[PDB]
Design a protein around this nucleic acid. Structure first.
Ligand SMILES: [Zn+2]
Length: 188
DNA sequence: ATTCAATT
């Protein structure tokens, strides 16, 4: 575990050097119809670099790297599995449609994606976000309650204490406003 | 409010 990088990433407003690779964190849980098993005790990290075992490159997208990990865990179709994904960027557009198809072909898996922030290069992919919320698995903005879990789970709070600042609130203001516009415009 | 795959 390295110094509070998760916390640093949120306040990385000025640290925006302009040369950083995207890293995704993943979690896996085992659920049995007869019994439930919590594998939350174990956790792992994922990089935007696709692993060689996945085969040839399918495109240049951080979300695709996450998609490559699902088939590598060889999940049983007869057993239910809950997987979580933590990311700090917009859901994308073409990839957003791919995640919707994945759940449709696998509704037995509980998948939730948390976006720390959403950056739209141009106004047009907003429609994908609406579809993403319906089939793009459950998406929510990172909050203090979830942040403490990610902070304690991804980084050991022992020796590495996280100091709360009014930064998460400032970030929430942008996401709460932008996300509110999409959900608020939810046409009946 | 925010940054940015292959071979021996
Ligand atoms: Zn993408």
């Amino acid at each position: 575990m390295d110094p509070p990088t998760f916390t640093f990433n949120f306040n990385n407003e000025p640290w925006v050097r302009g040369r950083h690779e995207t890293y995704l964190c993943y979690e896996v849980e085992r659920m049995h119809n007869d019994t439930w098993v919590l594998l939350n005790q174990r956790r792992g990290f994922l990089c935007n670099q696709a692993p060689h075992k996945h085969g040839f490159l399918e495109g240049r997208h951080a979300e695709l790297c996450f998609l490559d990990v699902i088939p590598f865990w060889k999940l049983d179709l007869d057993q239910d599995y809950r997987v979580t994904c933590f990311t700090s960027w917009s859901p994308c557009f073409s990839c957003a449609q791919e995640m919707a198809k994945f759940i449709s072909k696998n509704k037995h898996v509980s998948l939730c994606i948390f976006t720390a922030r959403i950056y739209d290069d141009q106004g047009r992919c907003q429609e994908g976000l609406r579809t993403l919320a319906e089939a793009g698995a459950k998406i929510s903005i990172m909050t203090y309650s979830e942040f403490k879990h990610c902070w304690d789970t991804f980084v050991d709070h022992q020796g590495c204490p996280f100091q709360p600042w009014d930064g998460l609130d400032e970030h929430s203001q942008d996401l709460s406003g932008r996300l509110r516009a999409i959900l608020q415009n939810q046409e009946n």
